[PDB]
Design a protein around this ligand. Structure first.
Ligand code: NAP
Ligand code: FOL
Length: 206
């Protein structure tokens, strides 16, 4: 009814859990943003026919996307705002909260719809990340660890890779990361423009 499917969170963060600065990402990573686009766009071949993915984001995050890349193509976009004066879109939804968005999609993309939902992604920001970390359906984190203590003013809200959360959140093998995204992905450290980063997949039991 409200939430059938599992939620997946996607984030790029430093080893200090830093995620943004001055309403923007503090780094310019071309191969990294390409990975974001692949993961969030990927739907299996067979299901290719009707299925689409959803990207859920906080308003400040909506605002932070280059006018040029917005709305995010090939994906159903939904902005979470407790205050919707309006929304500047042409098939882009607004919802009051995370659950309100799930009900909107399940009502909007039912049987009368040509367009079916494949995967649901929470793309941030910190406020939305916090609500998703508390949601009983969030069981997967697609994280990119940036090994550089970049000055940030916004932080990921839960230290999921830390000892204290280690009996709940588990890092999965690289091969099932690849299997989940479909394409093979670079293993180990990637160096792009002075930054060292790596792709990880973390899961938890519901
Ligand atoms: N590194 C990454 O992977 C990554 C991913 C995303 C964002 N970021 C960065 O994070 C920053 C944006 O983060 P942020 O924390 O400031 O904001 P955010 O979550 O994008 O947006 C906050 C706004 O979203 C709405 N919202 C969020 N959670 C809500 C809830 N549970 N119920 C209702 N409304 C809710 C509210 O909108 P109203 O005020 O309209 O009520 C709140 O002001 C930027 O620097 C961005 O670049 C980094
Ligand atoms: N792994 C990861 N990396 C990120 O940079 C990221 N960013 C957000 C939020 N911020 C942004 C900022 C820009 C674009 C963006 O313009 N994306 C385009 C690709 C643009 C291009 O071709 O280079 C897209 O269509 O996905 C997306 C999200 C959320 N989760 C993330 N997750």
């Amino acid at each position: 009814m409200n939430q059938q499917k599992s939620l997946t969170l996607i984030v790029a963060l430093t080893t200090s859990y830093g995620i943004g600065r001055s309403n923007s990402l503090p780094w310019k990573l071309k191969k990294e943003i390409s990975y974001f686009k692949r993961v969030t766009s990927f739907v299996p071949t067979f299901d290719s026919f009707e299925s689409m993915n959803v990207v859920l984001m906080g308003r400040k995050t909506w605002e932070s996307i280059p006018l040029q890349f917005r709305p995010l193509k090939g994906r159903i976009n939904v902005v979470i705002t407790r205050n919707e004066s309006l929304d500047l879109g042409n098939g882009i939804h607004s919802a009051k909260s995370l659950d309100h968005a799930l009900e909107l999609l399940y009502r909007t993309y039912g049987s009368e719809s040509s367009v079916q939902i494949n995967r649901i992604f929470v793309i941030g920001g910190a406020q939305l990340y916090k609500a998703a970390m508390d949601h009983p359906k969030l069981d997967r984190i697609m994280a990119t660890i940036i090994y550089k203590d970049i000055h940030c003013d916004v932080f990921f809200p839960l230290k999921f890779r830390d000892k204290e959360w280690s009996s709940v959140w588990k890092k999965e093998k690289h091969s099932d990361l690849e299997s989940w995204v479909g394409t093979k992905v670079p293993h180990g450290k990637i160096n792009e423009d002075g930054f060292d980063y790596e792709f990880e997949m973390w899961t938890r039991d519901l």
